[PDB]
Symmetry: none
Subunit: 253 residues, 2 copies
């Protein structure tokens, strides 16, 4: 396939010069198929994302991970046990309410900057239920958080009664223990990538949340309408700072 050939040429001819040693801290990108680790500067990260995005649109086998490190976007990994083997509905109102509750915990961490800021939430879903096992990722890639703050936010989210209700009404039988408490530290799959035994999560719905420190009770959440218009590998990346839709908002460390 042409776009896979293009990605192969980019990796071997050009990005090979950024190969990191096993257990390096400069590592930001992991190709688990080739077992290679890279520290890509922002320019070369984008070039990678353009190739991965072309490969994604053609359904190519990818297993790319990004390392969250100490300061990056927030990822929530939900591992659901369901009532049935039917994909739960997860319609915009349920996902919208999830975003609001997630935000209440972010706000309560006290690290948000003053002023008016857009933050984007993306929900990628396991394509099918297997033996009642289901999953979604919540990506807030633009909201740059300290690892310690992510862990704190995740701790609070596990105990959220409203979130547990939403998940229960979706048919989740483990609403108390479905959020991976290591969501803050685990390497995070790039959009279109998966473990070699699984299929890649699919973007169902994204939301734009605007917060304003001057008007704290006004928290508008709206579906993003022209998602297809953007490079989704790029926009959904927790470590990217040069997205078009997703512009970074820097939280206190």
């Amino acid at each position: 396939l042409a776009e896979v050939q293009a990605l192969e040429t980019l990796l071997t001819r050009e990005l090979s010069v950024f190969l990191t040693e096993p257990g390096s801290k400069k590592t930001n990108i992991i190709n688990r198929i080739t077992g290679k680790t890279y520290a890509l500067p922002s320019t070369e990260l984008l070039r990678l994302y353009e190739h991965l995005e072309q490969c994604r649109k053609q359904g190519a086998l990818m297993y790319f991970l990004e390392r969250q490190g100490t300061y990056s976007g927030l990822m929530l990994d939900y591992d659901l046990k369901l009532n049935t083997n039917a994909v739960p509905p997860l319609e915009p109102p349920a996902l919208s309410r999830l975003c609001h509750r997630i935000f209440v915990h972010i706000k309560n961490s006290s690290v948000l900057p003053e002023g008016s800021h857009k933050i984007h939430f993306f929900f990628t879903l396991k394509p099918e239920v297997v033996q009642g096992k289901y999953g979604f990722h919540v990506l807030i890639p633009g909201l740059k958080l300290a690892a310690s703050t992510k862990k704190s936010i995740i701790g609070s989210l596990q105990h959220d009664a409203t979130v547990q209700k939403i998940l229960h009404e979706q048919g989740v039988t483990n609403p108390e223990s479905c959020l991976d408490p290591h969501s803050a530290s685990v390497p995070s799959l790039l959009y279109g990538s998966s473990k070699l035994n699984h299929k890649p999560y699919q973007l169902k719905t994204g939301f734009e949340l605007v917060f304003d420190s001057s008007d704290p009770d006004y928290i508008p959440i709206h579906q993003i309408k022209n998602l297809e218009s953007y490079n989704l590998v790029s926009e959904l990346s927790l470590t990217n700072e040069q997205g078009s839709l997703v512009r970074p908002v820097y939280c206190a460390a």
Copy 2:
């Protein structure tokens, strides 16, 4: 002479025979990747040899294969050298230099204290990439039969990077990067099955192979002999890091905490 039909037949057989091993949630860890079709398979060791016989037939008929085997947590050793030469100088890599390389590699294996007791034949194979990519000359050392824990491979690779005798040997071959030519991911990288390659790159070529005999009772006696009749064997089979049913290469099983190794493979 272009075996269009026979290769197509083998491709259909492979897709059908592999289809039952297509990886899924709850299935075993993928060990075989067909990078052309992007399909991932978990073959029981029992079925690997049948795959290797089909890939060997495809190789001998000049088919462009792109099969990888995954090393996982327990498999044969593979050392991935990217050598920087004087512009486009091809290193001689004659038997005496390669023989000494085997000896040094073995000293680190022995020092790891994972070898099983008794007498064992351990086969070393040297494959070289025919073309220079970017002044880089590619060069694999395969010990496919010596089944090692990933953690032991990483340890052996670390020792080989800092081995003064190995650095000398590489230097005398015309290598200008003897300190940074050994890929520190050598333990985790996929291995192309013999005759497979990246889509427009050319396959690695077997130059020369050695039989080392080790005996736990007599550890200072390390006879190494060039193998003479290499083309007589199924080379996909014998060179495979995951194979256990080779004819030339009989597996020697080193100590591994299999579950521990699977936790450390994060």
